[PDB]
Amino acid sequence: KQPELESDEHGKTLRLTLPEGLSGEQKSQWMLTIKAVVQSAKHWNLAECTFEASGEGVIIKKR
Amino acid sequence: DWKQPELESDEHGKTLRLTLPEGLSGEQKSQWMLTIKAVVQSAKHWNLAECTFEASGEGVIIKKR
């Protein structure tokens, strides 16, 4: 399932789906990587960051 | 074994490194990369410091009232 944006009369909701049947720790690792991005969006303005793919996964760069 | 999200810095630069969840099929890896990509893209339209983040059933949610 691709990202889904639900629009409520009470606001919007971005819903992200995790792959079918992942294990328990794979689910946490995944979750943790997304939260690191939301945390970084609180310190940095991500529209002004460069986002590249790396060997291990991904890299978000500021300055 | 699995590296947690970590920052790296030095002169003229600060980076956030994210490691892929382990034991993933090529498909799931593609899915993982798109999820991270959907999140940076939302931070470009919304201010995520003013949004709620939480785990739901088989996923994650980000709400902007």
Kindly calculate the radius of gyration of chain A based on its CA atoms and give it in whole angstroms: 14
Q: Which of A11, A37, A61 sits opposite B15 (nearest CB)?
A: A61
**Determination technique used:** X-ray
CATH 2.40.33.10, domain A1-44, yes or no: no
Residue closest to B55 by CA, chosen among A17, A57, A19: A17
Contact B44, A32 (CB under 8 A): no
How, if at all, do strands B13-19 and A50-53 pair? Answer: unpaired
A27 alpha-carbon distance from chain centroid: 13
> Domain residues of chain B, as ranges?
1-46
Measure CA B15 to chain center: 14
> H or E stretch including A32?
helix A24-43
CB pairs under 8 A between A and B: 143
Q: What is the resolution of this structure in A?
A: 2.3
Cα–Cα nearest to B58, from A19, A54, A3, A63 = A19
Q: Work out the minimum CA distance from B30 to partner chain A, whole angstroms.
A: 10
Closest CA to A13 of B60, B36, B37, B33: B60
Q: Which fold has domain B1-46?
A: Helix Hairpins (6.10.140)
